[PDB]
Design a protein around this ligand. Structure first.
Ligand SMILES: C=C1/C(=C\C=C2/CCC[C@]3(C)[C@@H]([C@@H](C)OCCCC(O)(CC)CC)CC[C@@H]23)C[C@@H](O)C[C@@H]1O
Length: 250
């Protein structure tokens, strides 16, 4: 049974594609405005040295902070999001920010060399850059596995934006008040995605795979939170972050 997308579902897709195009610059032209990337000698991947310098933290914190601002803008355009109270909106944004960043970054991720390529060598981010920002393999390895698995689903941009929207409007986040309204908004998005898939996605299970990526994201979120807490213990770490990053992860 392949019901056609309703006029409403078509509108939801057009709105999400527009929101993404307005909030994700595929040329990465703003990145030179961030504090500059610095890459120190760390072939040994020394934790002591990485924590002592946190060379790539200013740049990656600025990239993440910028990305959170973009995610806030994207979320505000999701059909139904503005119906939620501001408190619920903020709870959802703070809890999903890192997950949406991991999802949206798949657009710059490339399997050519397993990096997030955003321009010249200066803005090519590799695993070694994340270690230079103070993170460990317990987060990085699973993150790369997630990027590759997501890349291989070969999602249509419609599916990609719907997945980000579904990730943000999740009723099971701790602290949510009106879970039922959030579930209604999410269900409207989920049905749109399921309909789109069994309608526009050429053969050769995709929906279940996408749902599984949302579960993987919860695991990555938890590991990232654990590592952020540890990083926050490093003296002077707050200056290398930004007020928005401090609030969202603090
Ligand atoms: C962001 C975006 C991009 C890349 C994402 C990356 C590469 C760098 C390392 C990141 C940011 C990972 C992250 C695990 O690295 C640094 C973690 C950052 C922090 O915990 C808080 C700032 C301090 C160490 C998650 C996603 C990774 C570029 C572009 O696709 C826009 C997108 O919007």
């Amino acid at each position: 049974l392949r019901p056609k997308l309703s006029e409403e579902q078509q509108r939801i897709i057009a709105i999400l594609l527009d929101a993404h195009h307005k909030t994700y610059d595929p040329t990465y032209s703003d990145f030179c405005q961030f504090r500059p990337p610095v890459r120190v000698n760390d072939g040994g991947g020394s934790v002591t040295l990485e924590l002592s310098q946190l060379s790539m933290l200013p740049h990656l914190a600025d990239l993440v902070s910028y990305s959170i601002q973009k995610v806030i803008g994207f979320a505000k355009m999701i059909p139904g999001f503005r119906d939620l109270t501001s408190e619920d909106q903020i709870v959802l944004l703070k809890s999903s920010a890192i997950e949406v960043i991991m999802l949206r970054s798949n657009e710059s991720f490339t399997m050519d060399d397993m990096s997030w390529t955003c321009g010249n060598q200066d803005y090519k981010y590799r695993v070694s850059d994340v270690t230079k920002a103070g993170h460990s393999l317990e987060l990085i390895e699973p993150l790369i596995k997630f990027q590759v698995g997501l890349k291989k689903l070969n999602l249509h941009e419609e599916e990609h934006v719907l997945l980000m929207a579904i990730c943000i409007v999740s009723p099971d986040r701790p602290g949510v008040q009106d879970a039922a309204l959030i579930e209604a908004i999410q269900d409207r998005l989920s049905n749109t995605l399921q309909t789109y898939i069994r309608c526009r996605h050429p053969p050769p299970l995709l929906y279940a795979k996408m749902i599984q990526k949302l579960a993987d994201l919860r695991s990555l979120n938890e590991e990232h939170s654990k590592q952020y807490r540890c990083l926050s213990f490093q003296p002077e770490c707050s200056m290398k972050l930004t007020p928005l990053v401090l609030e969202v992860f603090g």
